[PDB]
Design a protein around this ligand. Sequence first.
Ligand SMILES: O=c1ccn([C@@H]2O[C@H](COP(=O)(O)O)[C@@H](O)[C@H]2O)c(=O)[nH]1
Ligand SMILES: O=c1ccn([C@@H]2O[C@H](COP(=O)(O)O)[C@@H](O)[C@H]2O)c(=O)[nH]1
Lengths: 218, 217
Amino acid sequence: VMDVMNRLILAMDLMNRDDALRVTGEVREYIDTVKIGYPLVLSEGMDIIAEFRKRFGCRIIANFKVADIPETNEKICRATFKAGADAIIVHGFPGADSVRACLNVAEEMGREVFLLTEMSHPGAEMFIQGAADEIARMGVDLGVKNYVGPSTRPERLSRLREIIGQDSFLISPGVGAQGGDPGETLRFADAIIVGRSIYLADNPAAAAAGIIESIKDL
Amino acid sequence: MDVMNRLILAMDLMNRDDALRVTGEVREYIDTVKIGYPLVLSEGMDIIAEFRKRFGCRIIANFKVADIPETNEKICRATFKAGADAIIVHGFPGADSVRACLNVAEEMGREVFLLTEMSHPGAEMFIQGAADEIARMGVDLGVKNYVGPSTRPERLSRLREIIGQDSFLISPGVGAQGGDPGETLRFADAIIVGRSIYLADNPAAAAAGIIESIKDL
Ligand SMILES: O=c1ccn([C@@H]2O[C@H](COP(=O)(O)O)[C@@H](O)[C@H]2O)c(=O)[nH]1
Ligand SMILES: O=c1ccn([C@@H]2O[C@H](COP(=O)(O)O)[C@@H](O)[C@H]2O)c(=O)[nH]1
């Protein structure tokens, strides 16, 4: 599995290239894995992935929450890996064929797929939560090795970890701003995803350092 | 929304030159183009303004928005800043995520299209069972634009029943995925067509052919 430094992944959702680059550079000594999503990509272009690789020695996870039909999912994954992303996040709710499409491209291109099971926000309780355990089981059956689960719901994250097993890799967003606790989340997740708590801080480096200090024993 | 010929072109080619050439070849038949991630991630968001400059067509961004509220807001802002007139949003993530998109759309003078049931086989696993409820959620939220499957006319009809005849409904899955143009228009206001047109030997002839088959509609 990817070796995430300090078990901490930066969710870089600033939409300004200059700010995104500045903040990421400031926390570079604490984090070697960065998650770039559509807020930044739709604002600055896919080349931003290239720029991050050039400026920082960081792995890139594209949080594109892929959720289209198989044919379109394949195109999205191909374009994303072509740009330099090490991995891509894919939604499981659209079904097995949509996920399989992403897995096929990842296999062909030598990259990885992370399957998003349950989401961390309140609305996730309406439809996703009830399908989450099955979505996770589906991922296991499809051979998915990397997963994304909610920090905001410890009990749900715990169940997801059981379903996927100890060998699977699990990362979890919702830490900080959304209410999730770093240490508690790491009881089940291999790494925590943190965005606003770090990038909106007056001193992002200090914020990252503080989070790492709180989980030093882990 | 007045869609010419009730036909929306799904421009999923991933080359700027080809995307522009093919769209130009069928411009006389359409005035509404749906641009998705295949083209945007390959050529950049500047392609939206380019389409408006060359064709003056309306642009629907098929971005299947499906993140948390905070991120959905940012995605909608970046999308509308690029010149998109409307954006497609997934309903499965819940009401708060949809509301976030509705807020930005209202602020920038745009429209949100709520995707309730998808057109591919995998949609039967989790989405289909929640589709009717997702549609009712849209109604409760004041959504007036929806997306339903051409591949399942009975499901598309049910969606129309739930949202009423005043709501606007567009439908993908026509052609390549097996959906029929005319049957789909019994329930949807407009059909979305991608590959049947952009992968055709003669895109213009393909578009003309589809329109001929629905001339009476
Ligand atoms: O269930 C999910 C899946 C993805 N994210 C993403 O993870 C990051 C969380 O950032 P923050 O709340 O720490 O600022 C964002 O990029 C967000 O879009 C969630 O928050 N929850
Ligand atoms: O349930 C859905 C929602 C969206 N699309 C999109 O609509 C277009 C259909 O294109 P095609 O099958 O006519 O080529 C594509 O852009 C695809 O991603 C579907 O096909 N089904």
